[PDB]
Amino acid sequence: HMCDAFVGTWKLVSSENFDDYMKEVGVGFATRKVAGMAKPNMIISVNGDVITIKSESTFKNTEISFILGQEFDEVTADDRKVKSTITLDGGVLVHVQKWDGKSTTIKRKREDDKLVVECVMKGVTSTRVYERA
Numbered sequence: 370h371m372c373d374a375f376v377g378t379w380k381l382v383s384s385e386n387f388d389d390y391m392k393e394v395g396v397g398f399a400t401r402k403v404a405g406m407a408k409p410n411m412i413i414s415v416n417g418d419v420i421t422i423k424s425e426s427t428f429k430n431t432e433i434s435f436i437l438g439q440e441f442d443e444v445t446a447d448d449r450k451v452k453s454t455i456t457l458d459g460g461v462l463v464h465v466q467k468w469d470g471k472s473t474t475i476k477r478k479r480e481d482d483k484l485v486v487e488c489v490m491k492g493v494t495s496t497r498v499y500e501r502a
């Protein structure tokens with residue numbers, strides 16, 4: 370019953386400062402424009418110890434499967450090759466991505482009927498709000 374309140378199919382309903390987050394990450398102009406238009410669905414499931422997070426959009430479809438605390442390699446939607454570790458910290462999924470001596474952290478938390486995604490690169494935060502599909 371690890372992550373029960375996260376499981377399901379979620380749709381993006383609002384975003385703030387995502388262009389600036391992507392700039393801070395190093396995403397180029399054309400990818401920022403197309404990625405910024407997307408309205409992804411996030412599909413989260415659990416089977417034993419394995420959590421799967423899929424994102425489906427008109428930009429890119431991605432999927433990661435992982436065990437909490439256990440590093441894995443990830444190719445991100447913007448085509449970075451990163452090493453990722455996801456943990457549960459006080460009920461928040463905390464996803465750290467490392468590449469090229471850089472780091473970004475993505476936090477996913479349940480707040481009311483929303484799943485709130487906070488993405489941080491250095492001093493820049495973007496907040497993306499999802500609702501059940």
Ligand SMILES: C=CC[C@]1(C(C)C)C(=O)NC(=O)N(Cc2ccc(OC)cc2)C1=O
Binds near residue numbers: 404407409488
């Ligand atoms: C539904 C997924 C969740 C999440 C979130 C940002 C981590 C999101 O809400 N929206 C997305 O587009 N992506 C994809 C993404 C990630 C990084 C990019 O450039 C740095 C560009 C596009 C995601 O991975």
